[PDB]
């Protein structure tokens, strides 16, 4: 009915899609060999939003896997759920961009983009009524942050009316993973604004803080972070697949959550977070759920919200649950700290209720939130851009593929203006 | 079939865009194939059917042989790519005299024989894509003394490229027709 | 009327929250595990042959 | 019996024996939880 097209570019997007399709295959009960093996009937009625039908009852994940080097899809094929992915959905080159925006956006990522566009347009018209697209990538890289943003600029011109939300990866506050992310991330976010209507900003330090403080896991890998991301990615598209008493698709979470087209920057969370040693001492109730999302340490963007102010707040729930109590709890969290919400909108909270919880859980929630404190992600990236452009530090690696100098000035002026326009609502 | 349907200004049966286009259609193929292709003329999916014998392979519009679909709409329009090949398609209509009568349009014909079960007529086509227009009421008015009440079955044979087989209430010009029907 | 044999293979959870990953860290290391790169099954995008 | 020991661990875990002890206790509890939840799903084995 409302099918979802999933996009992944770069190795970060590839690992995220490797884990995201490990949860959707679990909840829809999909075998590693591609066969339904569950024990219910609610999981098969709306399976078309993620799985096409293949001859033999096989369910293949409808997705596009995009890269430029063979160094990371060997991992996604060698993964436990790597046999359900179709061979033709893999598009990749041999020598990658290597933390470069100019290459993967103009020279390398522009010659191979005709294959990815062909694969997308061949697959996307196989949906009965396409709802939209969803992309997971990293701004700090060169494969995703160039090529997936080229796809973002091209598919939007192809279908000028479909929903395009993205699960992007913004940088860490202190630790770096690449010396040049004040170039690729800003050059990707300059192009992100004019094509996307919703952007989930995820960063790795906030997930480390979640997996340490709120979880008591001592040795977490990147897969333990990919699972926490995939929890939110499954939570957002919940009501498409399962019925309930108050549904919300991605257009519902788009209309309700942005007052203006330039204010489409968001930051997510996830509700049930109890350690193994804190299982038996805590009860899965709706107040103990709703306490956690309005706390800073349970947030997937490293930005403290009491510096900022919530503009629009969304929340979807799961499970057969009471309703008077959840509305009472949102009213209580809205009326206690009145200084944390703007006063020109009285009702900032969106509520959608499903009835199928995640497996092994009974009550859960997924919070999508636009605020003012997300500016702190971009102010410092602008100050890093000014600290790097004033010395022309790595500029020779970018002008060597056919770039220009005034383009960087235009990008910095547009991002400074996007910076300035958010600040007026404090 | 299609008895409790509104039968609006346009009613569409086949479409190359979607999950299962040949859900209600029968797949008879002998020394041929059925496949779907991204076209290089309209940049979209088009059903593809061709085989070395033109009468062996086809698609029929109700899958069950005894079940028939009911369309009260008078006009039949189908978008086919002319591959300069042998292409035939045939309808079955009902009358007020309750007789099921058939019309056959053959690419390899130049003559017109009219007979109380099937009236064969020739067919010419342009270079590439086309909007072939069929008024079923006219065809049952000139060849036959009666008129048209219900279309029963439509058949599409090989050596052709189907997109968007549909019925319409009246001749729609290019302006009033929505962009998804071109 | 439904078999669904044993797997002995943990398949991701959130309330206990163990994540299915090959062991690369403390305690469970097992230094003689195979962390090597394997053979694929899809050729790369040789666009020179795809249109010729 | 295994979970009885897990609640008697240190409240501030820093050293390497404490870390590895927590890992083996978690592995034991999780093996037992998987075995229990697999058998509890039905009645015929």
């Amino acid at each position: 009915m409302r099918e979802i097209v999933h996009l992944q570019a770069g190795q970060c997007g590839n690992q995220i899609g490797a884990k995201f399709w490990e949860v959707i295959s679990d909840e829809h009960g999909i075998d590693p060999t591609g066969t339904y093996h569950g024990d219910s009937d609610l999981q098969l009625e709306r399976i078309n939003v993620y799985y096409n039908e293949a001859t033999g009852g096989k369910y293949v994940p409808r997705a596009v896997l995009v890269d430029l080097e063979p160094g990371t899809m060997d991992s996604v094929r060698s993964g436990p759920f790597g046999q359900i992915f179709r061979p033709d959905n893999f598009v990749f080159g041999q020598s990658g961009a290597g933390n470069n925006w100019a290459k993967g956006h103009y020279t390398e990522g522009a010659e191979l983009v005709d294959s990815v566009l062909d694969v997308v347009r061949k697959e996307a018209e196989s949906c009965d009524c396409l709802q939209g697209f969803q992309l997971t990538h990293s701004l700090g890289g060169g494969t995703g942050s160039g090529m997936g943003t080229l796809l973002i600029s091209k598919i939007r011109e192809e279908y000028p009316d479909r929903i395009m939300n993205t699960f992007s990866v913004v940088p860490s506050p202190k630790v770096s993973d690449t010396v040049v992310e004040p170039y690729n991330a800003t050059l990707s976010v300059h192009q992100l604004v004019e094509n996307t209507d919703e952007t989930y900003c995820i960063d790795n330090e906030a997930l480390y803080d979640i997996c340490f403080r709120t979880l008591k896991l001592t040795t977490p890998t990147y897969g333990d972070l990919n699972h926490l991301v995939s929890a939110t990615m499954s939570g957002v598209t919940t009501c498409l697949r399962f019925p309930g008493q108050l549904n919300a698709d991605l257009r519902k979470l788009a209309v309700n959550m942005v007052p203006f087209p330039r204010l489409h920057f968001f930051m997510p969370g996830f509700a049930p977070l109890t350690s193994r040693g804190s299982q038996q001492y805590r009860a899965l109730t709706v107040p103990e759920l709703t306490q956690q999302m309005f706390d800073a340490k349970n947030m997937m963007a490293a930005c403290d919200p009491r510096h900022g102010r919530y503009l629009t707040v969304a929340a979807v729930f799961r499970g057969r649950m009471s309703m008077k109590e959840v509305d009472e709890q949102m009213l209580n969290v809205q009326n206690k700290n009145s200084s944390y919400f703007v006063e020109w909108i009285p009702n900032n909270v969106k509520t959608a209720v499903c009835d199928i919880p995640p497996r092994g859980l009974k009550m859960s929630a997924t919070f999508i939130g636009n605020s003012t404190a997300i500016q702190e992600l971009f102010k410092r990236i602008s100050e890093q851009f000014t600290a790097m452009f004033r010395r022309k530090a790595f500029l020779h690696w970018y002008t060597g593929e056919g770039m220009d100098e005034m383009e960087f000035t235009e990008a910095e002026s547009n991002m400074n203006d996007l910076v300035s326009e958010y600040q007026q609502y404090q | 079939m299609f008895k409790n349907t509104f039968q609006s200004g346009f009613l569409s049966i086949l479409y190359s865009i979607g999950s299962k286009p040949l859900q209600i259609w029968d797949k008879k193929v002998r020394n041929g194939h059925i496949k779907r292709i991204t076209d290089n003329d309209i940049q979209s999916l088009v059903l593809e059917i061709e085989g070395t014998n033109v009468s062996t392979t086809y698609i029929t519009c109700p899958a069950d042989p005894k079940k028939t679909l009911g369309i009260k709409l008078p006009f039949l329009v189908m978008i086919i790519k002319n591959l300069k090949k042998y292409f035939t398609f045939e309808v079955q209509v009902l009358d007020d005299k309750n007789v099921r009568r058939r019309f056959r349009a053959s690419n390899y014909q130049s003559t017109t024989r009219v007979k109380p079960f099937i009236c064969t007529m020739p067919m010419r086509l342009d270079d590439g894509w086309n909007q072939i227009q069929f008024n079923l009421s006219d065809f049952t008015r000139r060849a036959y003394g009666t008129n048209y009440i219900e279309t029963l079955r439509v058949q599409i044979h090989a050596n052709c490229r189907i997109r968007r087989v549909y019925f319409s209430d009246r001749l729609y010009s290019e302006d009033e027709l929505p962009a998804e029907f071109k | 009327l439904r078999f669904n044999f044993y797997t002995s293979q943990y398949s991701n959870s959130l309330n206990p929250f163990y994540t299915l990953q090959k062991p690369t860290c403390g305690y469970l290391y097992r230094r003689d595990t195979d962390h090597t790169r394997k053979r694929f099954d899809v050729p790369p995008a040789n666009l020179v042959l795809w249109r010729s | 019996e295994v979970h009885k020991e897990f609640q008697s661990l240190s409240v501030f875990i820093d050293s390497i024996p404490k870390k590895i002890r927590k890992q083996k206790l978690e592995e034991e509890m999780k093996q037992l939880e998987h075995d229990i939840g697999v058998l509890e799903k039905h009645k015929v084995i």
Partner: peptide, 26 residues
């Protein structure tokens, strides 16, 4: 079993959940 919902343009088949537990057996 499945029930056919024939509308204009789009044709959809929808399944009906059954009330049987029916068990499993490892």
């Amino acid at each position: 079993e499945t029930i056919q919902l024939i509308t204009r343009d789009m044709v959809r088949e929808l399944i009906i959940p059954t009330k049987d537990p029916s068990g499993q057996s490892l």
